[PDB]
Symmetry: D2
Subunit: 452 residues, 4 copies
Amino acid sequence: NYPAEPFRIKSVETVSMIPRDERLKKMQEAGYNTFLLNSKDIYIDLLTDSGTNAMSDKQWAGMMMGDEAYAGSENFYHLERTVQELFGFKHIVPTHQGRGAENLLSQLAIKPGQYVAGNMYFTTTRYHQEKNGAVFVDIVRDEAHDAGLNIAFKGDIDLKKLQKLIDEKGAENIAYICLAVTVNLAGGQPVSMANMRAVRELTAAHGIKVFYDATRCVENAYFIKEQEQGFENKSIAEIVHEMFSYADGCTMSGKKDCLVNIGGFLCMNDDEMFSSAKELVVVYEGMPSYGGLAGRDMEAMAIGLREAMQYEYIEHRVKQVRYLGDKLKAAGVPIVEPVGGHAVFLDARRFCEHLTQDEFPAQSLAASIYVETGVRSMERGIISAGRNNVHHRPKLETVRLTIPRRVYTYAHMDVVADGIIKLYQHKEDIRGLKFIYEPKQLRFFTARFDYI
Amino acid sequence: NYPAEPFRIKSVETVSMIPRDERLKKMQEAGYNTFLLNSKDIYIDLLTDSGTNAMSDKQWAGMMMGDEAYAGSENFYHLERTVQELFGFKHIVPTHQGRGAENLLSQLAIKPGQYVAGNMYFTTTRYHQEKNGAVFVDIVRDEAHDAGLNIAFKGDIDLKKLQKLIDEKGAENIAYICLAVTVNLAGGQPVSMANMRAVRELTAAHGIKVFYDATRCVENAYFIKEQEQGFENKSIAEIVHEMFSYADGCTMSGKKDCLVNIGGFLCMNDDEMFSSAKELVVVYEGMPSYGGLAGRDMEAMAIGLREAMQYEYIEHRVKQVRYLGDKLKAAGVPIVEPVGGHAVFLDARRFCEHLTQDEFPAQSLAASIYVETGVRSMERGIISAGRNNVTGEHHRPKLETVRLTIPRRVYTYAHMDVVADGIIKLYQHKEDIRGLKFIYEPKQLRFFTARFDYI
Amino acid sequence: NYPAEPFRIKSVETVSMIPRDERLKKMQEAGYNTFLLNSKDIYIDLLTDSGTNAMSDKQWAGMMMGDEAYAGSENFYHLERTVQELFGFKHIVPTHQGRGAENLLSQLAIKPGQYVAGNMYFTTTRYHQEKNGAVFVDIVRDEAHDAGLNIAFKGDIDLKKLQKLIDEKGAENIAYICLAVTVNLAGGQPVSMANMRAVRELTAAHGIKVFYDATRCVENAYFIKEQEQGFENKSIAEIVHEMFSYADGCTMSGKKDCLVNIGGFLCMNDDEMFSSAKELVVVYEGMPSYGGLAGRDMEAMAIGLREAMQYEYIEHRVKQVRYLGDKLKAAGVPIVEPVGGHAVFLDARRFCEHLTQDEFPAQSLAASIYVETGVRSMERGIISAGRNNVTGEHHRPKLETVRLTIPRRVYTYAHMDVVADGIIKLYQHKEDIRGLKFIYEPKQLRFFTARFDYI
Amino acid sequence: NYPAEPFRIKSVETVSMIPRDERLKKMQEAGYNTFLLNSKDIYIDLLTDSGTNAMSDKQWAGMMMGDEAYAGSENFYHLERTVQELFGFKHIVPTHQGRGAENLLSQLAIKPGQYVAGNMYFTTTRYHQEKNGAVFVDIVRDEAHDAGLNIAFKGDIDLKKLQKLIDEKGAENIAYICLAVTVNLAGGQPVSMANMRAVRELTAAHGIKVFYDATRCVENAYFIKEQEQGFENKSIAEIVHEMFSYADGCTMSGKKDCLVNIGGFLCMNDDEMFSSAKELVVVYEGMPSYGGLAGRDMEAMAIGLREAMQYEYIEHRVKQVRYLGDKLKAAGVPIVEPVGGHAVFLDARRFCEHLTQDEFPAQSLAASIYVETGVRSMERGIISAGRNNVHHRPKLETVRLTIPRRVYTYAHMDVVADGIIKLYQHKEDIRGLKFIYEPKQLRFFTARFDYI
Ligand SMILES: CC1=C(O)/C(=C\N=C(/Cc2ccccc2)C(=O)O)C(COP(=O)(O)O)=CN1
Ligand SMILES: CC1=C(O)/C(=C\N=C(/Cc2ccccc2)C(=O)O)C(COP(=O)(O)O)=CN1
Ligand SMILES: Cc1ncc(COP(=O)(O)O)c(/C=N/[C@@H](Cc2ccccc2)C(=O)O)c1O
Ligand SMILES: Cc1ncc(COP(=O)(O)O)c(/C=N/[C@@H](Cc2ccccc2)C(=O)O)c1O
Ligand SMILES: [K+]
Ligand SMILES: [K+]
Ligand SMILES: [K+]
Ligand SMILES: [K+]
């Protein structure tokens, strides 16, 4: 039901084990904002799965083989051929991480006033689209916004919505479709191959380009192998390769499914766009031959992307997340369903119905969770959705327990679940928050609170 | 209760995950001898807790700071200060691992014909004692030889036996007392502080030296903290320091409780013996300032011994082993009791009570465990006992066991479940396990390269 | 005098050692464009001193201690304290390297139509200034444009030009002064402390901000210690701290003087600009607590910046480059003078005075150097200048040079001899060097992938 | 004439650069014994080439791939096949370093009262021979004991002496011939292939076994390629393999020519001796499958032994030593000739003729050299030769400047030479030593002196 880790522990990261009374003072020193906690005071850090992964012995051997040459590095060639083989795109440009690739794509592929349509959006991706003049259009199925609705492949694009956008706006005014795998904001929900194929067919008939946000494509491939009829006999690598065969290019944060702590890249099949991409990468990232990465990190990412294709690794990755979700759900703790590939999302408005929204139940729930167990989590609701000129009220008001790859055990998942549940058994005791410091911008990062 | 890992995974070691049918072929190519399996074919390797530990990020940082100088390495001085602080001995000599320290001690402290008495024995330790002319005497409590008896501090020396030896042989004819912590041969059983003090008191009244085999002294310290009344407010480091205050020196395999993959050392308080040890170490190991270790490894061992003093680390280490024993015992699987600090020992005589010992039930059980789970375990039964080469008969040990030896910080509870679930499943059909026979038996060291086939 | 390396080799990087005939084939397969050679085919790679440095054992120990947390990493706090101590700025934001910091600064500090004035320019720096609407003005001393003039502190800003700009355009229309240390385009020439103070004094009287391009500020500090009277009793760290006391902030490529393979940062004293920078860094680089770097790299950069303050290290760094220039100059080989902190620039116009600039003498000289020695160098001449795409004509730079760029702590004087001996041998038969012509020219970034063949 | 380093610097070992006045106090704190100096106070440490080498990036990648299994390690199999391929012996037993292999060989191959004959001897090797009851006989050519005599292949065995030993003692009373390559005590002097072939032919005709001390066999192979007629077209690896084809087994300290910081092994062709070796290694070293080494060190040594076969590496290794020797000899500094593979040996009785032997000119010369430059060196004369029951007066009274592999540059060699020469230009100023502390045993290690 829940497989054991398909690897051994090679080396350990020492943690402190400071007790509850001391954690309380550390939380109070952070003004009750988990973003202000220091890493040295954290037992289990579930802020994000981005860049927090444990590398393997083979990756660390590659780390000693960094060819740091400015051009012509063996590490660059290894990453290049690995991505060409596993993803099937003609051209690759490394970037220091995913939002560097998004910066390049959005400048290369958007004319001001055009539309970018996607299955929901991610913060940085949509910023770079809009900064370059695009209008974002959400074409995900309506169900993906219903947090409790347990349906498969919730990340799928609604073809009816895409058709409507083409009819109302015209194909020439659509810069591209942005298809993300998995869909982070919906809870890490996967996209079916049938949907990628149908989106490809409809866009190609109109000459519209498709670019993937590939950041968790291996988790997505696992959901396809597990749940999409006809893929039970296909390897993860076969599934990944077919996925990208329905795309014109992709942006990738290697910090996610390539099992590294830094790294990303931009892929594309078009030669002229590749030429333009090489001119632009020099401005922001570095020469096309390293893209703002040390040689040893191009090497680690090449090795990690291939490790991620191992069935047992990605099965265990996803089922470990699922174990945390299953234990919370069996206790009645309200969560986004179905559990996604990389995180369990608490529904904090359901958790703290005794507190009003304006008392910040997600922030105070995250604070309570650290004090009782030593775990940090992130905000994924109104605050992240931004404010609107004419707030950006989201249906998904979530607190994220984000699982780094290969870092934690099921016993760590139990510490997390036991603490969230023991809190949930006295849920009414948790206390609302009020600001005592709020900056104008990026407030989730440095704002400070106190109890009402 | 079983605590969560008081650490995170910093990096992982790749494993193959081959399925049962392919494990059966690897087991057959190994002649059904788990000692012959390739490491790359093993998912969970419980052959030994020696030298198989996972180091920390701080140790690996130390590995980048190896001062490889032949004499005067900063890493030696760090190892020296650390052992002087944590164990309290005056002098320390590094050795490449534990049996190199034993070689030195036995040459330094034994005159031929003298007796060495200990709480049971370990093979390398006793060999070096006997090779240098000592006669071994077991002075452990009789309870330690009852593998089913669930009692605390089973490793304790019987003071009456030690008193008896002093009276019959004479104090001047006893080279030293060899007190091991924990006691490996009894299943990893701890020694109480009460016992260490009484032994120190009795030997000191007669001028007799006491040297500890300190290889799992931190596991031992945890049992004292957990179970000896009056130690509940003492830190692991306090307990360790007090333990060694009752010895004249020690031999240590860092490969066990110092959380490293190689390394050991010899400690002593006597200045004259220290001079002689420095003269001998150059013969077998290296200079007194590196003792057959790279500078980076003295550094890793210095850091790891200090890491081992963290209460939550050693609590979890010992309770992870206990989890494995508890789950087996709850399904009725026969094991040595109580569970020791580092391993669970299956009682293969009872597990395979349809087989005779001449059909090698421990060897066969270990083969079955690997086939069913990808877990390697060690035969510790008639095969490892060897054959009497005077008579040609097997040595027939009372203990016919399979050792599930747990490396420190390498595995999780889910790995422990893989081990337990597969053993419990084997146990539910234990009568189906077949006997083995030799098809190749070397003259010596037969457990290492012997090959078998099913009867 | 040329000091010995004030370090030992801890580990080496394997190289192939292919002979001349096989180097000729690799050069031909690269289309005679050294930017196209494979790193594995190069013995001594002098393409750039950026990101190619050798780290120390202490830095590699830091690499094992990467706290990879998304926010609040211990490595960030270490980098923060270190830069606050050594540079003296109030606020620091990591960026993945120097041009990421430049992107942020130019967006934060420039209103469209304003002027940015500097001591010459660097390509990425000036691009981000112009992309955000600034007009660039060169206020370096006229001497810096005379490549043969052997004078000290050639990088100094002409205070009269800065005064002239303030009077003609108005102080409110100057976004900031961009003072680079050293000045790359003049050959790596240093700026005097006297000049930094005078610039600070003049700009402060008008409310004008000053930001340093601090990429080789430690090389710059060494020239001040060596050649500016009154600094002979000052430590490198004292000089560095005083330099930055005359700026409102800086952009830094750690890939140069912080002795790392990746990393950079943005510094400033202004609280309001710091808030805005924290809002912008999330757009392009990452959180203010990692800025597009792994935790291990913030750690390595923190350790390396502090290592760079050691006098003997930077003395040897700069004198190793000087050794290369001196040996070339003594054989009559034409170079930019005086030699800068990080590179020797061959004057390929004069070296190949039998070729026209349209025959690409720098590109060809660099191809010849690799064939004869296995040394890679960078074309910094008409090819890198690019083609005017409005008119189709080459951009024709006054400087037609080959850059021998020296990575820090990677090479020895014997490697410098390989470079010099081969160049001197080429020079003794310089008339034999052939012109090149395009056989493939990309529309943009032509120095990176253009291919050539001999005329 | 002197090639540049055939590698780049990947990482540096930080040193202090403390000046002369501070070095003087550190030397005085060491009682004027370089063995008592702390490594952190040393710029250039030339005490020994044993275990002090710089590893490569590929070796450090292998260090991250340590398979620490007690039996069946991939690292063991790699070392095993590498040694079988490069040395050609049937069986290999790892040991933690060379004297662990000597302990095994001497117990396996010596009956009490038998003779072991060799081309000179080394300290640990001869101790293990004699401890197991053998009588040592030196059968090196007489010239090898003449330090100033510049002749090629000074390490060669005198076949006339070997013949005499067989005739006087009888073949059955000779346990084995111990042939070392190079010969350390003679100054690192090489042995010719012609001599290894002739020793093999004579011993085999009498049934006498030959075991090599292989510790610097790659340096030896370089001397053969450079100087022995007919080997100029042979690769280093071809030469090494032919060398060991004239032996029944060998002891190897990997700490020397295998380019590692720890490690060694015992090789042999005989099956019964291998079986006996496996039983004995368990007592002293570890199981035959790791022999007292971590897996990662078996890996590093397998990689390093193959790196040592690169012609340009070993040419530069030897010529760097030769450069130091040439610069001293051009200044009139008296040295052992010809310069050997691993060290330059000062002749300190010729250097300090104004001081008597009993004033310890070698010790005080080593002290002076550290104070003026930051360099440590070792004693190789009477003190190392031991005392005799009925001193062991040696013709070779040498101070060794021992060069670790891949650690230092020619500029470091110049610091060393310039300091020894500037001393030699005022040689008469150096001051004799007297004991202020002398232990009974191992006195070179901890004894303390003062100036007369
Ligand atoms: C689907 C998807 C992502 O999840 C993604 C990064 N995720 C992140 C990191 C992050 C970014 C912004 C605010 C908070 C946290 C996550 O914590 O979820 C990026 C950017 O990649 P980058 O971080 O490598 O620039 C692109 N697409
Ligand atoms: C020819 C030869 C060697 O040189 C050798 C080691 N040399 C050493 C190390 C050493 C040993 C004893 C006293 C002083 C220094 C050297 O400094 O010269 C060994 C022992 O190997 P080991 O050190 O690996 O045990 C065997 N044969
Ligand atoms: C109580 C005690 N005292 C001394 C030592 C020696 O230390 P060292 O020389 O190994 O460092 C050991 C180590 N025991 C290992 C390794 C082993 C040894 C022989 C056969 C199989 C396995 C095991 O129990 O597996 C020990 O447990
Ligand atoms: C004075 C000065 N200011 C800023 C930067 C940017 O720093 P960063 O973004 O590289 O970290 C640099 C780095 N210069 C490199 C790299 C390079 C860049 C373009 C073409 C070729 C090579 C070179 O001189 O080789 C610099 O020298
Ligand atoms: K990270
Ligand atoms: K090991
Ligand atoms: K780099
Ligand atoms: K060493």
